[PDB]
């Protein structure tokens, strides 16, 4: 029973090269060099799927802080005040309001400032 | 690599040539070299216990008898001259299934020849009756003598 390593062998090669369609140079043409980049490609995909949440939260925080400064409040005091007021709007939607509806963000800024302690620096 | 022709000599020096160390042009990696673990002639027959063989056959015959797939016959055609047309007609009147195992005695050359040329009809002797044959056949047609011989040889 002599089996040729051709039908079976080409399947993973076609898969890896199809995935590598778009890579520069050998990484898109040679199965071996595409496989090396595909290992790194999916390692990065996993890493960046897990870091995308953090980096989008960073973007949201940057925008919320921008709107907070516009509304004359600090971002951390804004978050403190929102928590004290019991506003459970996450940073994604807060930044959405900051960008689309600045009046809503000003309303929430007023809420957070109202719910802040009379003295933020007091030990409480 | 020891059976393929040539390859006795070390192809080239051990060191200095910048090439991989080869000890023969017939090593397995070489094109045209020898097969490492390729097939060798083997005797696949297995010493299955006699009781296991007999029980498997009795079980196959039991399955057929339970399903009413065992038929008996005094003769296959009529005697003397074989007649495939007559034998096919009779096996049609008996069973409409395709695979039929005709357990016929050694002496009934007439019936053997007559039924021999039907496509899905294996012919076996009562002493050679075996699992694979009975299981492969949809029906089992015994000549009365063949059935009696099998029953005698087994009850004995």
């Amino acid at each position: 029973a002599r089996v040729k390593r051709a039908l079976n062998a080409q399947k993973k090669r076609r898969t890896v090269l199809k995935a590598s369609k778009g890579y520069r140079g050998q990484r898109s043409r040679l199965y071996r060099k595409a496989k090396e980049q595909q290992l790194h490609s999916l390692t990065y995909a996993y890493r960046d799927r897990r870091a995308r949440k953090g980096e989008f939260r960073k973007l949201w925080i940057s925008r919320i802080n921008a709107a907070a400064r516009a509304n004359d409040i600090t971002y951390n005091r804004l978050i403190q005040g929102l928590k004290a007021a019991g506003v459970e709007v996450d940073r994604k939607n807060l930044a959405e309001l900051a960008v689309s509806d600045p009046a809503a963000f000003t309303a929430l800024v007023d809420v957070a400032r109202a719910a802040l302690p009379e003295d933020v620096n007091a030990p409480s | 690599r020891g059976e393929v022709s040539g390859g006795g000599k070390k192809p080239y020096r051990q060191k200095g040539t910048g090439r991989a160390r080869q000890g023969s042009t017939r090593a397995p990696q070489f094109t045209g070299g020898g097969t490492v673990h390729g097939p060798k002639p083997r005797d696949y027959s297995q010493r299955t216990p006699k009781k296991m063989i007999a029980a498997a056959l009795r079980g196959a015959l039991s399955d057929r008898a339970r399903n009413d797939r065992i038929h008996a016959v005094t003769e296959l055609v009529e005697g003397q001259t074989p007649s495939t047309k007559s034998a096919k007609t009779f096996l049609g009147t008996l069973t409409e299934n395709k695979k039929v195992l005709v357990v016929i005695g050694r002496t009934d050359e007439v019936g053997a020849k007559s039924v021999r040329n039907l496509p899905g009809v294996h012919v076996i002797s009562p002493d050679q009756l075996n699992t694979y044959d009975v299981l492969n056949a949809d029906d089992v047609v015994f000549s009365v003598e063949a059935l009696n011989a099998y029953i005698s040889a087994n009850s004995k």
Binding site: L59, D72, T74, R77, K92, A95, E96, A98, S100, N121 | -
Partner: protein, 146 residues
Amino acid sequence: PTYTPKAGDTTRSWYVIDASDVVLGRLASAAATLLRGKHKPTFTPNVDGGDFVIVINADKIAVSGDKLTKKFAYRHSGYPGGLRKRTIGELLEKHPTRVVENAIIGMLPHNKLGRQIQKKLKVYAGPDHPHAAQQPIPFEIKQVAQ
């Protein structure tokens, strides 16, 4: 999905910052903030969404301690021994806009977008600037208290 600034979404304003008596670090930090656009809720780090900043009176910037004579701006030409150094005082004397601009590009990101951001920093050493036709908005550096 989160808002992404499209083609016709980056509106840039013009801020003029008076550097007289302002700390170099403060001025540069606030200028870099404006140039990046960290003050806009539409901020996106992959976009040059910032505002033009015109620093005036760059020659009367304020430093602290002995940095005016013991802090050196270095440059290497590539040729061996080609390390020139000029104290902040000498640099203010020769190229007054230099000190402030170097501080601001230092505080900017170091990449292609950073160098595209630099183009919006129009620092001037005199009390006057040419961009009066832009109606630049005066910008005082204020701290959002807590």
